[PDB]
Amino acid sequence: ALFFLIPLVALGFAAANFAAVVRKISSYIRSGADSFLAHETKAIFKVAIVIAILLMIFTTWQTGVAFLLGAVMSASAGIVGMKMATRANVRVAEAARTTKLKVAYQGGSVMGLSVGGFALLGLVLVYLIFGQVDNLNIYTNWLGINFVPFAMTVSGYALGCSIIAMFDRVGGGVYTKAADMAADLIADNVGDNVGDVAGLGADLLESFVGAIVSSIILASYMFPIYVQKIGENLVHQVPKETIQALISYPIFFALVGLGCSMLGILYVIVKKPSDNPQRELNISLWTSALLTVVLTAFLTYFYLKDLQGAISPWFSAIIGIFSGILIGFWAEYYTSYRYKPTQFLGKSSIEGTGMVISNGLSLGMKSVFPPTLTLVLGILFADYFAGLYGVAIAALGMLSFVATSVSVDSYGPIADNAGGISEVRKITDHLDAVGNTTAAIGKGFAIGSAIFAALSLFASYMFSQISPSDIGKPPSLVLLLNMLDARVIAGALLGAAITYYFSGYLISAVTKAAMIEITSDNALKQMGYPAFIAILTPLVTGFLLGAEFVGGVLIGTVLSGAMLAILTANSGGAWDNAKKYLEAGNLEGYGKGSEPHKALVIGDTVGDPLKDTVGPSLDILIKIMSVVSVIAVSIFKHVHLF
């Protein structure tokens, strides 16, 4: 029971860290937020109820309620983190004076702690409140969706969080980068929080919950899959207990996690103070992960000790953790002037706007390989030491310290805004540089986790066809999406193309809308397209062509989004800090007019729509499209047309 009250503590904790801080005429920003949020919430209102009724009508109301649980939960989490981000933010210029810092990071930390507390309050609710883990045969609902009691329930929850986040980003990411563009051409200072706090935070909430939900669905499934069949009895070769312990474990694991991170957060703010905030963020991160690996290993033994080895998914969490951390490092590497990507680009500023662009492209494109490689090497090990389930738990390891990742992330625009506000500027610009890096690190973890998560959720997808009319065949006959089949290839091409389209549209959206209520109303009103594209595609294409084709689309979608999130994040990422870098002069005889500053400006402005809107949008698409397909293939495995 203690474990079940653990998530509750994080939240009293969220409320406490801002308060000790908030007690620390630039209010201006808070008004911006309410307006967009007003308009946004109303569209959200309109939509969430409706999706809920839909799920309730078409799948199994338990799931629709859980779905609402997720909508209230994520909206709320984001809202709290926003009051903080928008208060440390103000309170930073004033930290920044007496100091010739605690503020920026504590504000960022409020959204992250709130994110953990809420997401888990909600999930614990879904777990307790939703005999589906008792039943876990293979129920075949009021229509013909033959749904998973529990899988279906938490899938509903995860879809809820993912969808409201995507909306928050594709509108807010849009309001924001549309704003940055507009500003360097005011609007922007609000943009920094809408964009890299609320939106980025929502993206991460989504990957995290998605990976955990996938762990849950899989357990909820070794059951119909492994059943014996020696001479026409069904013998459950995997007995219920093992499955139940394996279901509850990622939950228990996730509880063990956030806890490790909460210490990191309470530790660094109140910790005796440093003078360099990059090392803090990375150390805190590192710490949360060591701490988490060990205790997680205990949790794993005892809470899985004798099921019928034990520790295995703990190795999965570890492989994922170290992979995740490496990917963070890679993101820092590619985004911070101080090492290589930005410095070269930056100095090339002096050679003619063209070079900043072409080199920024080369930089992000090449920069794409190492995080993917970590993931390639990362998947295999996550995967070798455990079943499919070990991969999903691994996604979780990448994200096992989400509280600190998100804290550090929200630090950026929060620190970043602190910068814009004085214009003292040096302290402020450092804060800004780090915003751009730490938001790029964050993006990097969530993309990694999107891929690691995506393979369990995809496996779950082929698995979901395990209709009543299956419950015989070997697992090895059912988990077999064949790539040589033309439907899968066509599917893949279409999904990939869907991904490039989705990005181009999101780009175009940024520029149209860019050139509070005008663009907020416009962003939302003008928001349906990405959500339709993202969501109905499995449905449209699925209902058109069946399980092989949606399996394909999902594959293309995942591959492309994986590559592109990173391109935009890192390269879009380097350009801001390249601009800052030259703005700080650093090139001798160069400093804020002149052909190079102008060129770096062009880099930051080019980067801004890609990194803060497109890539991260792909983060979301590759999940929400898969979850939708996992559910609707219930219908289109059988019901496809041709």
Annotated binding-site residues for Ca(2+) read: 576, 604, 608
Comparison of 143 and 515: residue with beta carbon closer to a second copy? 515
Answer for which of 237, 353, 467, 526 binds a second copy (CB under 8 A) is: 353
CA distance 402 to 119: 11
Size of the site for a second copy (CB under 8 A): 73
- Residues in 150-189 that interact with a second copy by CB under 8 A: 181, 185
Comparison of 521 and 604: residue with beta carbon closer to Mg ion? 604
Helix (H, G, I), strand (E, B) or coil at 603: helix
Q: Residues annotated in the binding site for Mg(2+), as ranges? A: 180, 184, 189, 192, 416
Report how far Cα 632 is from the mean position of its chain's Cα atoms.
Answer: 23
The residue among 529, 526, 540, 456 whose CA lies nearest residue 495 is 540
Q: Residues annotated in the binding site, as ranges? A: 177, 180, 184, 189, 192, 416, 576, 604, 608, 611
Residue 40 touching Mg ion (CB under 5 A): no
The residue among 452, 433, 434, 315 whose CA lies nearest residue 371 is 452
Q: Which residues contact 220 (CB under 8 A, 6 or more apart)?
A: 132, 133, 136, 148, 149, 150, 151, 243, 247
Residue 336 touching K ion (CB under 5 A): no
**Radius of gyration from C-alpha coordinates of the chain:** 23
Residue 263 touching a second copy (CB under 8 A): no
- Write down how long the chain is: 642
- What six digits make up the tokens of 224? 């119909």
Q: Which residues contact 440 (CB under 8 A, 6 or more apart)?
A: 331, 332, 334, 335, 569, 570, 573, 611
Comparison of 180 and 548: residue with beta carbon closer to Mg ion? 180
- What six digits make up the tokens of 84? 């903080």
CA distance 130 to 632: 21
The residue among 177, 136, 128 whose CA lies nearest residue 157 is 128
Min separation Cβ 315 and a second copy, Å = 15
Residue 576 touching Mg ion (CB under 5 A): yes
Q: Are 197 and 410 in contact (CB under 8 A)?
A: yes
Min separation Cβ 338 and Mg ion, Å = 17
Stretch of 32-40, 210-218, 416-424, 449-457 contacting Mg ion, by CB under 5 A: 416-424
Stretch of 129-137, 164-172, 249-257, 351-359 contacting a second copy, by CB under 8 A: 351-359
Residue 192 touching Mg ion (CB under 5 A): yes
- Residues in 469-528 that interact with a second copy by CB under 8 A: 479-484, 486-490, 492-494, 496-498, 500-501, 503-505, 507-508, 510-511, 515
Min separation Cβ 390 and a second copy, Å = 10
Residue 331 touching a second copy (CB under 8 A): no
Min separation Cβ 332 and a second copy, Å = 19
* DSSP code of residue 339: S
Residue 362 touching a second copy (CB under 8 A): yes
Residue 93 touching K ion (CB under 5 A): no
CA distance 215 to 417: 38
CA distance 104 to 410: 8
Residue 383 touching a second copy (CB under 8 A): yes
Comparison of 313 and 572: residue with beta carbon closer to K ion? 572
Q: Are 75 and 172 in contact (CB under 8 A)?
A: no
Residue 479 interacts, among a second copy, Mg ion, K ion, none and using kind-specific CB cut-offs from 5 to 8 Å, with: a second copy
Comparison of 39 and 487: residue with beta carbon closer to a second copy? 487
Q: What stretch of H or E contains 13?
A: helix 2-22
- What six digits make up the tokens of 383? 């995967």
Residue 47 interacts, among a second copy, K ion, Mg ion, none and using kind-specific CB cut-offs from 5 to 8 Å, with: none
Residue 186 interacts, among K ion, Mg ion, a second copy, none and using kind-specific CB cut-offs from 5 to 8 Å, with: none
Size of the site for Mg ion (CB under 5 A): 9
Comparison of 104 and 133: residue with beta carbon closer to K ion? 104
Task: Determine whether 276 is exposed, middle or buried from the number of CB atoms within 10 Å of its CB (0-12, 13-18, 19+).
Answer: exposed
Residue 359 interacts, among Mg ion, a second copy, K ion, none and using kind-specific CB cut-offs from 5 to 8 Å, with: a second copy
The contact set with Mg ion (CB under 5 A) reads 180, 184, 188, 192, 416, 420, 576, 604, 608
